[PDB]
């Protein structure tokens, strides 16, 4: 019972400094993300119908991104001052994981088609899309089911939960949202690129560059967040020490890098759909017919 070091570590200034940055990026992601993902769905549905299995996954990817960014104006209203905590958190993670699920499904569908010559009809792709959405919900369960509304604030009662829960929650998020998806799309697109590069395709050059971009963009937008989660998990795991100042730097880093990763769903329209000439020409026709 020495003159106790039980002094609270305050984060009041960090939150006040991070709020304007977070609010800004939220508005940016919602603006371009809703427009870009609408144009995706609009291009593959309006004039021409769904042709291949890729079109099915593109729409589902754009739909997942739409559901994600549409929660941001709700969170912005939350930061500024019915706002359902559990439900809004649910749509936040379900749309996030589904976005990562279909992205993974893009590579797989194009993997089995190129090297193993296994093609999927539209009818089957719709069935798999259902499975992924279901899988995205059951994997989001431990992220929103603990979230409730107390004193008009969305909170997670860590006292009524085990100490291992925030650790498991981080580990699942790290391997589930980064490691596994990045590992799959890298292996798939490496195999694909290595076949096309030696083929006699007259577009073999651009195909590889497109697939490389998918991997590069994913890393430069998600890696800073998960690498910050790793050192945060290390703190919880008591593997490293943590002073008051360290927890403040880690707090700010988690907030900033998280908002950075939200920009990736705005780039998805540029990574898959509007990178193809057919969708480029189609949009050019649509924008001309509506003007």
């Amino acid at each position, epitope marked *: 019972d020495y003159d106790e070091d039980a002094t609270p570590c305050v984060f009041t200034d960090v939150l006040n400094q991070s709020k304007p940055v977070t609010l800004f990026l939220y508005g940016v992601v919602f603006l371009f993300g809703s427009i870009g993902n609408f144009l995706v769905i609009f291009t593959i549905t309006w004039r021409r119908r769904i*042709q*291949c*299995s*890729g079109d099915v996954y593109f729409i589902n990817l754009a739909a997942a991104d739409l559901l994600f960014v549409c929660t941001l104006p709700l969170w912005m209203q939350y930061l500024l001052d019915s706002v359902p905590c559990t439900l809004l958190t649910a749509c936040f993670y379900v749309a996030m994981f589904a976005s990562l699920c279909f992205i993974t499904e893009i590579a797989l569908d*194009r993997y089995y*088609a*190129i*090297v193993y*010559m296994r*093609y*999927r*009809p*539209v*009818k*089957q792709a719709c069935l798999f899309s259902i499975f992924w959405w279901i899988f995205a919900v059951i994997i989001a369960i431990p992220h929103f089911m603990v979230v409730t509304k107390k004193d008009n604030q969305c909170m997670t009662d860590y006292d009524y939960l085990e100490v291992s829960y925030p650790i498991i929650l981080n580990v699942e998020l790290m391997l589930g949202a980064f490691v596994i998806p990045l590992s799959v799309i890298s292996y798939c697109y490496y195999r694909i690129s290595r*076949i*096309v590069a030696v*083929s*006699q*395709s*007259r*577009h*073999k050059g*651009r*195909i590889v560059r*497109v*697939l490389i971009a998918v991997v590069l963009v994913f890393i430069i937008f998600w890696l800073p967040y998960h690498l910050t989660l790793f050192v945060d998990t290390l703190k919880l795991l008591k593997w490293i020490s943590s002073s008051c100042e360290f927890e403040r730097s880690l707090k700010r880093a988690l907030i900033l890098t998280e908002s950075l990763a939200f920009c990736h769903c705005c780039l998805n329209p540029l990574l898959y759909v509007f*990178v*193809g*000439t*057919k*969708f480029r020409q189609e949009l050019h026709c649509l924008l001309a017919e509506f003007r």
Partner: nanobody
Amino acid sequence: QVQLVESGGGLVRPGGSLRLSCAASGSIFTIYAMGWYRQAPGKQRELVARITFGGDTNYADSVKGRFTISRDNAKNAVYLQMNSLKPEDTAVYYCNAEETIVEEADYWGQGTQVTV
């Protein structure tokens, strides 16, 4: 370079049948769909039959019920059985192939003549 070789055209009496054949000469693994196009004198180029390697088929309004399109994966070949031919079907039939990821369809055949 990959070229689409066409064969199976010719002349036939009204009500007869023909079988168009198209395949890729080179080695390409990124083709996911192929189809047939035609162009009558004084008219524009129109789609008549398209099939993907997944199985989903697409026919034109005027043609549906008479022509049957089929394909062969690994060989990148597409065949078109044209039963119950009409004099209005007289045009130059072109073969087309579509490519994944890059989403390009600049793969065309020389064009075969079909006169009924």
